[PDB]
């Protein structure tokens, strides 16, 4: 799934 | 960054690390005062940590300064991620020197095939998880309309960009979020998301920079 490439989002 | 090199100490001055007591995205100097990273970044209590090789060692050339304003786009939807783009005040304005400098913004858009640069203390690793000391380097080009909208169907905005590599191994990562996508010398991009890292014909998706160079500017003079 797609996620945002933070420490520590996915949808 | 996955696939990518060791940049070497201070060879990309732009490049600072978001730190919470741990680092958590980066992000990319663009004056003495004010720093782009991603909207999906944003939190209280933001220290910006300038001239950074090693993030877990004061090895000297680092500043360490407050984000006294945080702003997320106005219009930034969490769920989509289209306008992912926050800019960061500094309480302080940094010293600039060779090993802490600003990036310019583009005047125009770059066009696919473009080499980038894209760095960062994120993941390393596209299966687990490794976390760099040392600032890690990429070079990555910017893929076509089609070829982002046919591995990202319905979710590409005109704010959006891809970049990288469809058959696996090179990547942005974890950890990297909010940090720079720059190609011959102008701040195209911003670490923004992807559907894993460095997996087959999933690249980066990166937000698109000039598409934002009049809200940064207007943003700035009015702050
Ligand atoms: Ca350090």
Same mark, same amino acid.
């Given at each position: 799934?797609?996620?945002?490439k ?6 | ?18 730190? $919470? ?50 702003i ?33 913004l ?12 894209i $760095? ?48 696996g ?39 698109k ?15």
């Open positions: 799934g797609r996620c945002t933070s420490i520590x989002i996915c949808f | 960054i996955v696939g990518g090199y060791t940049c070497g100490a201070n060879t990309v001055p732009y490049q600072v690390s978001l730190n $919470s007591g741990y680092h958590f995205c980066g992000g990319s100097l663009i004056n003495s005062q004010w720093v782009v990273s991603a909207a999906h970044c944003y939190k209280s209590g933001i220290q910006v940590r300038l001239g950074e090789d090693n993030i877990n060692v004061v090895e000297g050339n680092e500043q360490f300064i407050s984000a006294s304003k945080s997320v786009h106005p219009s930034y939807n969490s769920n989509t991620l289209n306008n992912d783009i926050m800019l960061i005040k500094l309480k302080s304005a940094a010293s600039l020197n060779s090993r802490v400098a600003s990036i310019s583009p005047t125009s858009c770059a066009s696919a095939g473009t080499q980038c640069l $760095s960062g203390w994120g993941n390393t690793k596209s299966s687990g998880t490794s976390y760099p000391d040392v600032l890690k380097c990429l070079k990555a080009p910017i893929l076509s309309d089609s070829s982002c909208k046919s591995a990202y169907p319905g979710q590409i905005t005109s704010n959006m960009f891809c970049a990288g590599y469809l058959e191994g090179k990547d942005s990562c974890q950890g990297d979020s909010g940090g720079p996508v720059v190609c011959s010398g102008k701040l195209q991009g911003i670490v923004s998301w992807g559907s894993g890292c460095a997996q087959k014909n999933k690249p980066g998706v990166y937000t920079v000039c598409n934002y160079v009049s809200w940064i500017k207007q943003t700035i003079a009015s702050n």
